[PDB]
Amino acid sequence: QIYESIDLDELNENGIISIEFVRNRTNTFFRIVDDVTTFNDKSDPVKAE
Amino acid sequence: VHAEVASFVKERSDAGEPMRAIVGGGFNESKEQLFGRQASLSNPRVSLV
Amino acid sequence: GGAYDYTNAIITDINQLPDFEAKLSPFGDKNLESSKLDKIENANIKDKA
Q1: Do B35 and C26 touch (CB under 8 A)?
Q2: Can you say whether residue A7 is alpha, beta or left, with left for phi > 0 and alpha for psi between -120 and 50 degrees?
Q3: Contact B39/C11, CB-based, under 8 Å?
Q4: First to last CA, chain C
Q5: Which residues in chain C touch residue A13, judged by CB atoms under 8 angstroms apart?
Q6: What is the tally of helices (H) and strands (E) in chain A?
Q7: Do B39 and C26 touch (CB under 8 A)?
């Protein structure tokens, strides 16, 4: 992964799925942060989400 | 191939057999590639990893 | 006043050309309304970005 705390905004605004590596106090895992499609605009969820 | 399959999913959608798709780009492709792939495919029913 | 109210429509149509390509900047989302673009006057591209 190249993406840090701001790069995940650049991916999501551009409509690109982003996967993050998560670390808690004890254990680690992986989860997805958004379900955006490759549609340009964020205002219309029916196309975007 | 992203454009080709996007055409296919759009063709089936028009045919009343709705579909959606998820796709990715190569091995560890960065922002320089992704923003070139995304602009070529900025439409719903496809998502880029 | 044609279809080219958006700069990214100029991107996709420069990329349709054999001798030229256009690529949006990676430094944030800069889609820009075409009526706010500015002066360029015979700038050479052949060995420049």
Answers
A1: yes
A2: alpha
A3: yes
A4: 28
A5: 29
A6: 2, 2
A7: no
